[PDB]
């Protein structure tokens, strides 16, 4: 007949969340074209309008060049397959500089300061085929059955 | 004894076919910092729902 | 065409407005925002376009 007190800890990250308040840059003048984009994955730019100015972005595919990472937003995103996505023909929030939490497909912690190599689907992999100039910023955690990594991005 | 070992409620219109409830969750962390710092961590929120018949 | 709000309309939920200035080193910056929807046609059989004139 004696009392007890328990302790529990919150999780640290979530797919598509900005890591911290460092020097960052968000492009919101882009539009999703030809499909949907998953929050926490790299995107590529197809073409930029010469007069209007809106950029056309879509999901990363083999042989392409990454441009940014879609971030979280409770107002602009659409709920589907039990997660947040960006539908076709809608404004998107691309991140061009700063620290962001990205999805990963690897099994081991990465080395701080090394170069990031992506998969053909825009998700992080230790032995991917697409090479970038972004870096690992040290963060390495895991949500419920979801592996995330903290990545530093600069302008292309 | 099924109706007496478990609670019974009446918050459901006779003409309804389905119902839904919602759950919420949160994440975040804190860090030890100096005075001239610019890298404060962040937090977020969550949400989920379910159905019945 | 037939000018009737029941046939077609334009919605402007939010009007033009200005935000407070955000100062930098020696200059400012002022953003402006608004909302719109575009033209929606409820009954497309009440509009006729004669082209090639």
């Amino acid at each position: 007949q004696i009392n007890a007190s328990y302790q529990r800890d919150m999780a640290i990250a979530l797919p598509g969340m900005v890591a911290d308040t460092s020097k960052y840059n968000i492009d919101g003048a882009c539009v999703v074209n030809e499909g949907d984009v998953l929050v926490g994955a790299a995107v590529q730019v197809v073409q930029a309008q010469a007069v209007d100015g809106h950029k056309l972005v879509k999901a990363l595919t083999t042989g392409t060049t990454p441009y940014g990472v879609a971030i979280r937003s409770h107002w602009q995103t659409v709920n589907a397959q039990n997660q947040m996505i960006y539908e076709d023909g809608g404004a998107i929030n691309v991140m061009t500089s700063g620290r962001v939490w990205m999805l990963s497909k690897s099994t081991e912690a990465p080395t701080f300061g090394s170069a990031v190599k992506l998969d053909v689907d825009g998700q992080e992999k230790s032995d991917g085929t697409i090479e970038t100039t972004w870096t690992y910023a040290g963060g390495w955690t895991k949500y419920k059955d979801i592996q995330l990594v903290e990545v530093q991005l600069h302008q292309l | 004894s099924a109706l007496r070992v478990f609670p019974v409620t009446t918050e459901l219109s006779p003409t309804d076919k389905t119902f839904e409830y919602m759950t919420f969750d949160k994440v975040g962390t804190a860090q030890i910092i100096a005075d001239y710092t610019d890298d404060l961590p962040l937090v977020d929120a969550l949400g989920t729902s379910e159905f019945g018949k | 065409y037939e000018k009737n709000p029941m046939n077609m309309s334009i919605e402007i939920p939010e009007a033009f407005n200005m935000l407070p200035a955000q100062p930098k080193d020696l200059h400012f910056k002022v953003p402006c925002t608004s909302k719109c929807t575009g033209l929606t046609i409820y009954r497309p059989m009440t509009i006729v376009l004669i082209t090639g004139v």
Binding site: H74, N79, Q83 | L46, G47 | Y42
Partner: peptide, 26 residues
Amino acid sequence: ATMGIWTAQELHRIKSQSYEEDYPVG
């Protein structure tokens, strides 16, 4: 499950006017 806190229904509008097809009797 990493959804948002607002469902699509809570940001949805239903116009309070419906259109019915017409059929003259003769």
